[PDB]
Amino acid sequence: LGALRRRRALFEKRKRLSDYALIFGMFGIVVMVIETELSWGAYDKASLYSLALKCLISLSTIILLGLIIVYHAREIQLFMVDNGADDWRIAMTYERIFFICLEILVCAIHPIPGNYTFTWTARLAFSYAPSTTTADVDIILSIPMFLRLYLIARVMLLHSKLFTDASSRSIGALNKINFNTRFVMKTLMTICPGTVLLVFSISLWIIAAWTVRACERYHDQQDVTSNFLGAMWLISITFLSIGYGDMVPNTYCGKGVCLLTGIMGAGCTALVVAVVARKLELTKAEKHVHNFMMDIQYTKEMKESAARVLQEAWMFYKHTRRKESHAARRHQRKLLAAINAFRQVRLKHRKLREQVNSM
Amino acid sequence: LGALRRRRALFEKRKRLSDYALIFGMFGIVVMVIETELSWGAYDKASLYSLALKCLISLSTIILLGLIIVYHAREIQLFMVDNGADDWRIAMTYERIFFICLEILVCAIHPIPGNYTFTWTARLAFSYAPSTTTADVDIILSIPMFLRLYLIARVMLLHSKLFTDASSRSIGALNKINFNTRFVMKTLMTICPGTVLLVFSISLWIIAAWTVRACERYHDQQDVTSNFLGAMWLISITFLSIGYGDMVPNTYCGKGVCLLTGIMGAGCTALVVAVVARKLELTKAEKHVHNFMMDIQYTKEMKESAARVLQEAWMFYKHTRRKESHAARRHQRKLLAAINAFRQVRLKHRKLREQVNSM
Amino acid sequence: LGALRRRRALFEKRKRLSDYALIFGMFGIVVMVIETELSWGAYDKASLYSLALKCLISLSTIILLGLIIVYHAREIQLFMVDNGADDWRIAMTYERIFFICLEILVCAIHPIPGNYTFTWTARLAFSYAPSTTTADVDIILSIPMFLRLYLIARVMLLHSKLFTDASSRSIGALNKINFNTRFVMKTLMTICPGTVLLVFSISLWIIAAWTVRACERYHDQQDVTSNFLGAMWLISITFLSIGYGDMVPNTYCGKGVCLLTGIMGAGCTALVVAVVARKLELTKAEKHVHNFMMDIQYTKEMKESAARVLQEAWMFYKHTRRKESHAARRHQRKLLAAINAFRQVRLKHRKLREQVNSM
Amino acid sequence: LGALRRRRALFEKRKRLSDYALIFGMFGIVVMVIETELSWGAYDKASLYSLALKCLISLSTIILLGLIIVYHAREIQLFMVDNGADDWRIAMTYERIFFICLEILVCAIHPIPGNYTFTWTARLAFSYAPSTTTADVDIILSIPMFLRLYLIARVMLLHSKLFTDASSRSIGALNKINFNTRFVMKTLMTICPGTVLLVFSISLWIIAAWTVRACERYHDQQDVTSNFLGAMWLISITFLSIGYGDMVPNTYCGKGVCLLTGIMGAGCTALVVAVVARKLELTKAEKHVHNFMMDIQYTKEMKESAARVLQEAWMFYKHTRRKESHAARRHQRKLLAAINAFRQVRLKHRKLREQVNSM
Amino acid sequence: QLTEEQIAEFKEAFSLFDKDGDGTITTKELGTVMRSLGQNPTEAELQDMINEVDADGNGTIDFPEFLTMMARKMKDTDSEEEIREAFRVFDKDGNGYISAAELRHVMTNDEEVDEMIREADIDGDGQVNYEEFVQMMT
Amino acid sequence: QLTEEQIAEFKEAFSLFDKDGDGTITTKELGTVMRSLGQNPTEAELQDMINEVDADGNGTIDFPEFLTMMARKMKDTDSEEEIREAFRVFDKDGNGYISAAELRHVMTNDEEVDEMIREADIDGDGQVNYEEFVQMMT
Amino acid sequence: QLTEEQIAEFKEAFSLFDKDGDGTITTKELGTVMRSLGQNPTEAELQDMINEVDADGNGTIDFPEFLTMMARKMKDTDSEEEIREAFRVFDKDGNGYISAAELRHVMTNDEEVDEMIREADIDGDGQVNYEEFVQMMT
Amino acid sequence: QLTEEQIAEFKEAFSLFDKDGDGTITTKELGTVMRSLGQNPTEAELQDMINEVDADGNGTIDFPEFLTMMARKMKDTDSEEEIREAFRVFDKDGNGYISAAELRHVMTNDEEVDEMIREADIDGDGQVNYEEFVQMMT
Ligand SMILES: O=C(Nc1cccc2nonc12)c1ccc(C(F)(F)F)cc1
Ligand SMILES: O=C(Nc1cccc2nonc12)c1ccc(C(F)(F)F)cc1
Ligand SMILES: [Ca+2]
Ligand SMILES: [Ca+2]
Ligand SMILES: [Ca+2]
Ligand SMILES: [Ca+2]
Ligand SMILES: [Ca+2]
Ligand SMILES: [Ca+2]
Ligand SMILES: [Ca+2]
Ligand SMILES: [Ca+2]
Ligand SMILES: [Ca+2]
Ligand SMILES: [Ca+2]
Ligand SMILES: [Ca+2]
Ligand SMILES: [Ca+2]
Ligand SMILES: [Ca+2]
Ligand SMILES: [Ca+2]
Ligand SMILES: [Ca+2]
Ligand SMILES: [K+]
């Protein structure tokens, strides 16, 4: 009784902290995208604008790590209430220790304020001529910031009604259904598989094309892959497994992203073509009407084919009585074609009769 | 009663206007293809022939927009009769306003008479050397004219018997089937999926290969992708997801069309191989005969395998009585092979017995 | 009665002529392969060896056209017996006229003796530099000679027992099965789909790789695609839809063959992976044993998981009685892990119970 | 009785020799990888280190061939006990002779100590410029040493409980299940298909990428494919069938490995996407709960849609009584949208009712 | 009246629904047609739906009856059917009459509903019936 | 007469259709064979099919009769069965006879059909039967 | 007490489990709900599970009863149910009392088990029951 | 005798085949185990197969009999079962005795078969039985 009030109060606290972790997680990503794009041409890494925006990212990282710590503290309190424990140490299992530190490590990677540079040497594409540049270290930290998109999966899980409803929990309990993040994803692939596979593809299309562009701008002076629409074409053709054309990443960051694009592009392509294949198939009710209408059409076609069989049969006989040779043979040839066409419509009608009886 | 006469009269008016919108829609496309091809070498954009043919396109656009307006006016009258309303304003919903304007916008894009030019700068393929030309603006308007092919989907929908028959409407009503453009497409994929996927593929093969050629002729002086058979090979290999080879679009128009080719080429390839897979499978009646014949063959093979088991068994025993060693061992080795071959034919026969019992 | 003797006599005449048409059809292909390969380096088109071998091909074409005419004459006599007609003109339908002429046209294309040459101009690959050569016209006629491989489909059809057995014809008649070339192919894809798809792939692998090599030797002075192992790699990677690499056909013959390779390589790849997927699946009997064994394993695992639940529960209680804190908490943490592991093995066991009940 | 003791004693002898054949088989491979990598830069083929490590490989080949001979000798004794024979010659069938010699031939290929060299001439990629080098013959023998990985399949087969349990053998006997290497692989693809297809892919990813690197280092002075991360990218993109980019093998060894990568990459890709598709599908119990919850949601949505139908109906009537025109028409338009939305929720609810009744 | 082609099409549909050709659609024929469509209609609901269009109450569908049903049905959306289904969704008790408390219950998913009830009770029987619902809808 | 191989194969087929080996294909054996083919033949339909080739009318199938059935069915398409099925689908009433009005009806999917009917009724009974249908066919 | 929103949610769940609205979950309603989930529960096990939360023993589930069941069940893993299932696994004989012999048998998958049995026998009846098992677990 | 490990494995297999633990595999237990494997064995064939290894003929399988069955069965191929199945294939009449004419018929898929029959008839009863077949096979 009192556990229900505490559990539902911690559910709303965890849900509220997940939203705030998403607000600051995506704010840091948005500012990182702006800062990376602007610091290329608009200003430099040593400008006061670079320090100001990178301090905004760092401040949002401190807040995000604060909300991750507090959210995992609510998971400890929820664990103690769920399992009846009263000591927080009991909840601190090796699996939980690893994942709390893993989320902190993922969310603590950001472009630390201050200009630090490292020597980037990459082998150019289609020419194999090495090119070296003094790229900033903040590109090694801007790209991993996209790992914060896992907070979207947490917000969706904590906001789904199947995870926070009393009726869903009771009904699922009677069938012993494990309600977790996998179940919500599986149900999302049955309600709206097309929308899930389209908001996923056309969102990481820009995320990956920007990651390739932001990585292949230090090693691209010809505006080939550093172009946004060039990288959007590269990521799309690699997604569809068509190829690379002349657009091959000159860095192992672009090659790596074109590898994750090809991996998720071998699965998402198969799942999309398996969804558009389930939407072009007649339902159980629609197929019954279609086979009902084709039975009427085949019934009429059998009448007209058998009528042709008899019509050409009488033409053969009448011309035979008229002692004709060329005309009688022409209608005899037509009689065999009428009989063959009558057999064809009879066989394809019985193919329908076996089809209606199968279901 | 009186509604049936009005509905069936507006059905024939809508169907007649759909045909005329297709005649002028495809006439403009045919003249656009001729005008684009001829104005490259035969004449120039400032010639009187260019003005005469582009005035034919513009005149056919005025007629097409007239028939689109009148057809949508018949849809208003049909809506008023269907829903019992007597005022046209009731039918004017936001969804209908958007689609009426969308069709007008789609059908109003055409090569407006008069020579206007814009600077086209594209990055060449496999060399990354920029190439600039003064391409005419009528190529930005000729390509979108292929969006008028949606009128084919309207003509097919309004001409299908399942959409205009009293028996189909009554039977579908008893099962609450929604008769629309999606239902007709789903039924077309069950009657003749191969023909639908072949008239679709081998028609946009030329439409896309001409679009790539017409776009990559301003930026192609080596006759690589501007060639029609070069662009037909490019679109086919991109459709099959093989790659680009040396044939990579030098413009974002060719890259875009090679992207839509790769998208519809990842779906149409999967649907075609799923159709040719349903035509190599034995039907319910054919499989019964095949398993009936294999049961007779396996029954005979068991007699001959068991006969080999007994024949080699007696050869072993007779040679043993004859005190032979090499011959007795050779037939003993043959006896184990006869027994193993008899076990194999017995197992594969029972694999058939379980197969006939499963269905 | 007398019709059965005549039909079975014409069956053996048609079967004998199909074999002889295959002997001379494949003899001409074998001699064409030898003549094409040898006339490149061993001799020239004007040598007496070229005339002698091309006269062997032409002579075998005359015999092949003779056996095609006689075989189609036996089909006329078989048609007259089957349909009760006594005049050959009745059998001469438009479909039969077209196919008799089509087979003659297919089998009459060969390297006519005598040296004739035509100017071959092709755009080289990856450099777009035109290259022109005076290729012989006998390459335009050697490649279409591979269309004679359709005689293999006729020999297989006429030799299959399902097409020439009295028991198969009677059993198929009771189920109204249409015995034709499609039925034999469908049954071949159920008995040995792997062998059919392997004798087909690893035979046109050499046929297509030789066709690409024989076409891309006039326009290949760098030994890139004219190499046999280069063309075998090209045809294989295009079959698997990987790409072209540096091996792109410099002629439209190689591009065309790499297009038919990519077409049949999008279907054969899907059918092979759908066959190796049906051979890694447990049969109905094998799955029953596997689920029977996993039920025993899960039953034992539930005993050991519940034993761990009770063992750690007593460790918690005994350490609690001993007034321990660190040890009691460690075993309390182990108790929750034992309970969670006991729930996991209980859920995956019931996943098996629902699995055995489903079938 | 006595046969059971002998069979189970030879089972443990065969299992022990399979493990030792794997220890020395993989020791030779590990030393071969070290020797090949080190002899490139660390020393030369004529150094005493090359002779010492190649003598370690040769010594491990002698031991491996000894354990292969002894293991096949235990298979002879097991054969004699199983089939009741007392003479070893009976077991020596042609199939067994070929496979004993085949395993010896496979396991006897190794880098024989002593420096022997052969002239390697390969056509470079994307430039077609021949490059010749004096590569050692030990690269022709190091690569085939990876064929010793078949001993892993033997160790897994002999260690599986389904192959060595008395309960599994008895239960499988009642259903006449053939227990062999294929059955264990089929069961591994049902228990953990993802783990089998991941330990297989991410193990031959390094095996093939090292094979390509070790082969394309004699003919690669630009560090393109000889790079390990370059060859890992090449093998991955060829596995996914994306293409080659600029990374095309300059040798037929790399082309061959990129061909086996594309072959197993057309099957493993299809099997992985067919496994991740069976893990995103709701189970029988989970689907029952999901359709139970969607029925509750649709029931509530029908109440709110019908309430909107009645609410807007009264707004139409009340405004009609108020003699309003613009407001009455706006609510009449809303009434048709409420009715259409009520029909949509009614149809999608009955789509659910037919779905629950189907299963 | 309808044209000859329309009359022929509707007569072919009627003959499809009328196997014996007596000119009336017996409920058994409608049931067997519905079973041919995969549906499993009980006798009660089949009789209920066959009298929905029954003007004369004879229990069978003659040609003008089926023609009126088609005139109501050939349209993409049938407003009358949707109004009837909304009414059936409303009446949880299933008695065919929707009461004031029931309207209050369905409005939660006070003066306005009171005015609606007052203006809907044309006959002054103290409750809202199907005829009142269809009058308010139109 | 047929060659030894043909006779042997035909006797093999007869053994397929004759499980008990008594030399006659009874109704029960045909029923079991057809059920083994996945079909569900009724007793009346199977009896009608079994006398379709029964020359002597004894109700069972002997070897020469099976030879006649094969001689009819070994061809890709047999015209006799097609003519019989066309006659059957012409028979809306199923009485085995086609009236002049029936012919006029099946011709709409007047003098020519009248002349055809006058030339088809060889026995002059005022109607067309199956033997007249096959005579007009050939 | 729980908030108004939580009370409303649990009441809607209860009404989902209780169709007739009488305020008590009859075993027939639970059985038909379970059958609506594809499961096939027998009357014996259904009655056994409906009395698992039965405090007053009336044979029906009132709103506080279902609320207590939910408080036990809303958590991801139910420790009490897992303890009960482990107990049901232990007693092979199914009599509800676990004896030392089968305990020693399940420990093999001597002094320690003897001490556990001695410390678990709170009532000194010579055997271990479910209450002793749950006391030892907690 | 077999080792302790092997005895334990065979005993756990026997307990898998023997639910009640009485030490004898009742034919009902074998039938329910086979039904658990998806097979549908009739009582006649189940009894026939349960007496195949029944040395003392009590109608049940004790541990030594199941151990002998396993010793005959753990091998990849069972020669005795294959010989028995070949014998069952030979006797189409199903009487358990293969006559000389039957052998002559099965050899076509004269002096040699005569010598085989003469040397196989150890008891001189004029026919070949199962024991003669297994003696000739070995
Ligand atoms: O160019 C092709 N397809 C398409 C291009 C663009 C948009 C499309 N939307 O749908 N298909 C489309 C195509 C290529 C090869 C074949 C072959 F099978 F003949 F090889 C057929 C078609
Ligand atoms: O060249 C090939 N195939 C084909 C080429 C041309 C027309 C065809 N029509 O059908 N297959 C065809 C092939 C490639 C690789 C393999 C591998 F599996 F061994 F890798 C097998 C075959
Ligand atoms: Ca009637
Ligand atoms: Ca009436
Ligand atoms: Ca009411
Ligand atoms: Ca009222
Ligand atoms: Ca007879
Ligand atoms: Ca009649
Ligand atoms: Ca007559
Ligand atoms: Ca109740
Ligand atoms: Ca109670
Ligand atoms: Ca007990
Ligand atoms: Ca106790
Ligand atoms: Ca027992
Ligand atoms: Ca016994
Ligand atoms: Ca006998
Ligand atoms: Ca005897
Ligand atoms: K590709």
mmCIF file of C-alpha atoms in Angstrom, chain B residues 51-174:
data_model
loop_
_atom_site.group_PDB
_atom_site.id
_atom_site.type_symbol
_atom_site.label_atom_id
_atom_site.label_comp_id
_atom_site.label_asym_id
_atom_site.label_seq_id
_atom_site.Cartn_x
_atom_site.Cartn_y
_atom_site.Cartn_z
ATOM 1 C CA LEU B 51 9.468 28.939 -78.459
ATOM 2 C CA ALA B 52 6.947 26.949 -80.515
ATOM 3 C CA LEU B 53 7.430 23.672 -78.633
ATOM 4 C CA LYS B 54 7.639 25.371 -75.235
ATOM 5 C CA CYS B 55 4.383 27.160 -76.075
ATOM 6 C CA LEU B 56 2.871 23.750 -76.816
ATOM 7 C CA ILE B 57 3.969 22.591 -73.359
ATOM 8 C CA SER B 58 2.595 25.757 -71.746
ATOM 9 C CA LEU B 59 -0.708 25.450 -73.620
ATOM 10 C CA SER B 60 -1.019 21.812 -72.542
ATOM 11 C CA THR B 61 -0.261 22.962 -68.990
ATOM 12 C CA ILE B 62 -3.167 25.419 -69.139
ATOM 13 C CA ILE B 63 -5.484 22.660 -70.376
ATOM 14 C CA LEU B 64 -4.139 20.205 -67.789
ATOM 15 C CA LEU B 65 -4.695 22.736 -64.999
ATOM 16 C CA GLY B 66 -8.180 23.315 -66.393
ATOM 17 C CA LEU B 67 -8.995 19.604 -66.291
ATOM 18 C CA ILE B 68 -7.483 19.302 -62.807
ATOM 19 C CA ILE B 69 -9.689 22.165 -61.598
ATOM 20 C CA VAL B 70 -12.778 20.667 -63.255
ATOM 21 C CA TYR B 71 -11.987 17.161 -61.989
ATOM 22 C CA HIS B 72 -11.642 18.498 -58.445
ATOM 23 C CA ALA B 73 -14.914 20.349 -59.025
ATOM 24 C CA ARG B 74 -16.546 17.008 -59.834
ATOM 25 C CA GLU B 75 -15.034 15.643 -56.619
ATOM 26 C CA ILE B 76 -16.784 18.486 -54.778
ATOM 27 C CA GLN B 77 -20.123 17.598 -56.377
ATOM 28 C CA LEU B 78 -19.509 13.908 -55.670
ATOM 29 C CA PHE B 79 -18.672 14.801 -52.064
ATOM 30 C CA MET B 80 -21.897 16.797 -51.702
ATOM 31 C CA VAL B 81 -23.973 13.921 -53.092
ATOM 32 C CA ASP B 82 -22.187 11.278 -51.006
ATOM 33 C CA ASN B 83 -22.467 13.171 -47.710
ATOM 34 C CA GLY B 84 -25.864 14.764 -48.373
ATOM 35 C CA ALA B 85 -24.527 18.324 -48.294
ATOM 36 C CA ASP B 86 -25.834 20.989 -50.662
ATOM 37 C CA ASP B 87 -23.100 23.626 -50.174
ATOM 38 C CA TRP B 88 -19.669 23.297 -51.779
ATOM 39 C CA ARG B 89 -17.894 25.099 -48.901
ATOM 40 C CA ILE B 90 -18.495 22.158 -46.571
ATOM 41 C CA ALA B 91 -16.259 19.929 -48.713
ATOM 42 C CA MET B 92 -13.318 22.371 -48.610
ATOM 43 C CA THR B 93 -11.282 20.787 -45.826
ATOM 44 C CA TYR B 94 -7.637 21.603 -45.095
ATOM 45 C CA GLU B 95 -6.542 18.212 -46.441
ATOM 46 C CA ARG B 96 -8.471 18.828 -49.672
ATOM 47 C CA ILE B 97 -7.176 22.403 -50.005
ATOM 48 C CA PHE B 98 -3.578 21.201 -49.679
ATOM 49 C CA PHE B 99 -3.958 18.402 -52.233
ATOM 50 C CA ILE B 100 -5.818 20.529 -54.798
ATOM 51 C CA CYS B 101 -3.043 23.124 -54.578
ATOM 52 C CA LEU B 102 -0.376 20.398 -54.547
ATOM 53 C CA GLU B 103 -1.661 18.863 -57.784
ATOM 54 C CA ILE B 104 -1.875 22.316 -59.373
ATOM 55 C CA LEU B 105 1.681 23.104 -58.254
ATOM 56 C CA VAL B 106 2.937 19.749 -59.557
ATOM 57 C CA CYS B 107 1.159 20.169 -62.899
ATOM 58 C CA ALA B 108 2.083 23.858 -63.337
ATOM 59 C CA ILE B 109 5.850 23.250 -63.398
ATOM 60 C CA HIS B 110 6.933 23.248 -67.042
ATOM 61 C CA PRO B 111 9.520 24.893 -69.326
ATOM 62 C CA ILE B 112 7.965 28.375 -69.538
ATOM 63 C CA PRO B 113 8.576 29.806 -73.036
ATOM 64 C CA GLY B 114 11.495 32.184 -73.282
ATOM 65 C CA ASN B 115 15.202 31.634 -72.714
ATOM 66 C CA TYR B 116 16.352 32.133 -69.123
ATOM 67 C CA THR B 117 19.707 30.818 -67.913
ATOM 68 C CA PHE B 118 21.402 30.232 -64.567
ATOM 69 C CA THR B 119 24.987 29.446 -63.607
ATOM 70 C CA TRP B 120 25.430 25.730 -62.884
ATOM 71 C CA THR B 121 28.601 24.811 -60.985
ATOM 72 C CA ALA B 122 29.207 21.127 -60.275
ATOM 73 C CA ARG B 123 32.138 19.138 -58.926
ATOM 74 C CA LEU B 124 33.187 16.543 -61.497
ATOM 75 C CA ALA B 125 33.484 12.876 -60.585
ATOM 76 C CA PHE B 126 36.710 10.973 -59.843
ATOM 77 C CA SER B 127 38.701 14.170 -60.420
ATOM 78 C CA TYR B 128 37.016 16.727 -58.099
ATOM 79 C CA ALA B 129 37.717 19.484 -60.636
ATOM 80 C CA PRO B 130 34.907 22.078 -60.632
ATOM 81 C CA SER B 131 33.168 22.674 -63.959
ATOM 82 C CA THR B 132 30.818 25.605 -64.562
ATOM 83 C CA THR B 133 28.340 26.154 -67.394
ATOM 84 C CA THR B 134 25.457 28.481 -68.254
ATOM 85 C CA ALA B 135 22.649 25.921 -68.209
ATOM 86 C CA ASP B 136 19.115 27.011 -69.042
ATOM 87 C CA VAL B 137 16.533 27.257 -66.261
ATOM 88 C CA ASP B 138 14.191 25.006 -68.266
ATOM 89 C CA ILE B 139 16.109 21.948 -67.041
ATOM 90 C CA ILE B 140 15.047 22.807 -63.476
ATOM 91 C CA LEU B 141 11.451 22.685 -64.767
ATOM 92 C CA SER B 142 11.604 19.830 -67.297
ATOM 93 C CA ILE B 143 12.617 17.215 -64.712
ATOM 94 C CA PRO B 144 9.763 17.932 -62.227
ATOM 95 C CA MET B 145 7.320 17.440 -65.114
ATOM 96 C CA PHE B 146 7.768 13.698 -64.543
ATOM 97 C CA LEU B 147 5.729 14.157 -61.356
ATOM 98 C CA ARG B 148 2.699 14.206 -63.690
ATOM 99 C CA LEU B 149 2.981 10.404 -63.872
ATOM 100 C CA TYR B 150 0.794 10.344 -60.748
ATOM 101 C CA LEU B 151 -2.111 10.870 -63.163
ATOM 102 C CA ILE B 152 -1.494 7.290 -64.321
ATOM 103 C CA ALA B 153 -2.304 6.098 -60.797
ATOM 104 C CA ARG B 154 -5.538 8.099 -60.939
ATOM 105 C CA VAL B 155 -6.524 6.704 -64.344
ATOM 106 C CA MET B 156 -5.833 3.127 -63.229
ATOM 107 C CA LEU B 157 -7.806 3.629 -60.008
ATOM 108 C CA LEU B 158 -10.819 5.163 -61.769
ATOM 109 C CA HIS B 159 -10.780 2.490 -64.499
ATOM 110 C CA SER B 160 -10.510 -0.587 -62.264
ATOM 111 C CA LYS B 161 -13.705 -2.625 -62.121
ATOM 112 C CA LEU B 162 -13.317 -3.180 -58.366
ATOM 113 C CA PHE B 163 -13.782 0.587 -57.927
ATOM 114 C CA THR B 164 -16.749 1.042 -60.292
ATOM 115 C CA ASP B 165 -18.814 -2.175 -60.005
ATOM 116 C CA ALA B 166 -22.066 -2.631 -58.104
ATOM 117 C CA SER B 167 -21.264 -6.250 -57.210
ATOM 118 C CA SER B 168 -17.784 -5.434 -55.893
ATOM 119 C CA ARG B 169 -19.100 -2.523 -53.817
ATOM 120 C CA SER B 170 -21.841 -4.661 -52.258
ATOM 121 C CA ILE B 171 -19.585 -7.637 -51.495
ATOM 122 C CA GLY B 172 -16.853 -5.409 -50.087
ATOM 123 C CA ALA B 173 -19.469 -3.638 -47.974
ATOM 124 C CA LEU B 174 -20.450 -6.881 -46.229
#
